[PDB]
Amino acid sequence: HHHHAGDQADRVADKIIWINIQNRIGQFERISAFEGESLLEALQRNKVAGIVATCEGGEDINTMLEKPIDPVTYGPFCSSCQVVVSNPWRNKMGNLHYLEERNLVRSSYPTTENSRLACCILVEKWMNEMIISIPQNPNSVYEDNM
Amino acid sequence: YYNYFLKSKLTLFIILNNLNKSIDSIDRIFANANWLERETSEMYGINYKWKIDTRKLLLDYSKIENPMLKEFQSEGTQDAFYNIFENQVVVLKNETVEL
């Protein structure tokens, strides 16, 4: 920030991160997110559809959002925050962790080569105008429809 | 139309002069007007705009004409015979016998 004395507050619009997403109805919808928020958090705030979000971000301690990822982290807890990122965004993201790959591999619905966990995705300034798609994630248990 | 409340008969006559012969459709108002307007369009070419159904009613399949018109002759133009070269019914020009 480095805000000085007497300076006026900054408009949140200057910190608005744009995500163009293909929703399960095949709809191009634009979501706005704040820096540092998880993709799952942004989707929940914007009420995006298609993401079951069974684990609601998984564990709260030593989460995958922390940088660097701790070796004692438990990784994702469900397979519902599946989002396919664009080629530039996925290239900038990098390679999925070992636990991320292990969890994404054991998914009932088919996955894509650019599939990443929304709860494991962190908002970076590089992700402005980021393109994502949200194929319909699976439903697991009897309480998933509750 | 017939009004049972007044027990009378009314006849609305609409004059059409546009070359397109397009008029509004009362099918969405009166239920019987669907088939009636379909037959009217199929026979005279009165285009019922915003009609419930524009499907053909009585005209022969694969035939595009308005026989109920002052221009159309009695015999028409197309007559169907049996094409042995096709082993089925084909359609050719109508060569009719005249009185």
């Binding site: 109805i25 | 499907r55 053909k56 009613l57 009585l58 005209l59 022969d60």
Partner: protein, 64 residues
Amino acid sequence: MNRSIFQLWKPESPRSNVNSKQIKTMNVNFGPQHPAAHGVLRLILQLNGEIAERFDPHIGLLHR
């Protein structure tokens, strides 16, 4: 008797595969050469379980 409305109605919801007609529609036709079709009607009737669902009467087969 008891209420059986649900056992008689089946509406279709937007993009709801369950609410759609989840069966191959038997698009049988009461064509011209049928004993009960009166000879000059082709009543294309979408029938579901021997119960007519939709009607499209091809008429004009005897238009003279």
